[PDB]
Write a protein that binds this ligand. Structure first.
Ligand code: NA
Ligand code: NA
Ligand code: NA
Ligand code: NA
Length: 232
């Protein structure tokens, strides 16, 4: 619930990946401040160079750090499933290119929130925008649209990421998401709403390994009832 997230929480991310047979691992470390909707993380490809552009992994690499406004807090499924956690699964379909499938478990290990991920990518073009590394090192802002999944006692989400390509074109990545609580504990199943996300990608000038520094801001919106500040 909310009490686990009222201060600054350490984060660990571990990803094991295979894209078109190319095997890689990523580790990330940082901290999250859900009260303010802010995350800061640094990721390293621990196996060497990454075979896909870092921007294509941003969405896979802890929506429990979203800032839900007071009037919407009963719609925060993510924190309601903590500390036991949830399984997050996605299909990410890159237009005119391959597809990632991801399975992650997000849960507390003591005082650290841990995101452990397996990613499998198939059908990528050897010199498309992904395996050909034609994407700019940046990120546009997007909304994540959430709906309840009563049958699974969780949520589904959908969104479309627009990755800037170096030639001025845009590479679409259609995201389909499911989240299911771990274990049998009660959860909050939300009304439809969205998360508004803004990400800044940068580099550590003192880091020789292939890496990504990430600052993210995430708020929830899309429900107005109960917010008395909007009356007048
Ligand atoms: Na709570
Ligand atoms: Na990159
Ligand atoms: Na838009
Ligand atoms: Na952004």
């Amino acid at each position: 619930g909310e009490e686990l997230f009222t201060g600054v929480v350490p984060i660990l991310v571990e990803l094991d990946g295979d894209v078109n047979g190319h095997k890689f691992s990523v580790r990330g470390e940082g901290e999250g401040d859900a009260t303010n909707g802010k995350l800061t993380l640094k990721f390293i490809c621990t196996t060497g160079k990454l075979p896909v552009p870092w921007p294509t992994l941003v969405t896979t690499l802890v929506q429990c750090f979203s800032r839900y406004p007071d009037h919407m807090k009963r719609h925060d499924f993510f924190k309601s499933a903590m500390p036991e956690g949830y399984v997050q699964e996605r299909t990410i379909s890159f237009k005119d290119d391959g597809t990632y499938k991801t399975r992650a478990e997000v849960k507390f290990e003591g005082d650290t929130l841990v995101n452990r991920i397996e990613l499998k990518g198939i059908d990528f073009k050897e010199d498309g925008n992904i395996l050909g590394h034609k994407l700019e090192y940046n990120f546009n802002s997007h909304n994540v649209y959430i709906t309840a999944d009563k049958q699974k006692n969780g949520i589904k989400a959908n969104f479309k990421i627009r990755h800037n390509v170096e030639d001025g074109s845009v590479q679409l990545a259609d995201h389909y998401q499911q989240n299911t609580p771990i274990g049998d504990g009660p959860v909050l199943l939300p009304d439809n709403h969205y998360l508004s996300t803004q990400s800044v990608l940068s580099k550590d000038p003192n880091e020789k390994r292939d890496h990504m520094v990430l600052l993210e801001f995430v708020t929830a919106a899309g429900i107005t009832h109960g917010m008395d500040e909007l009356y007048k």
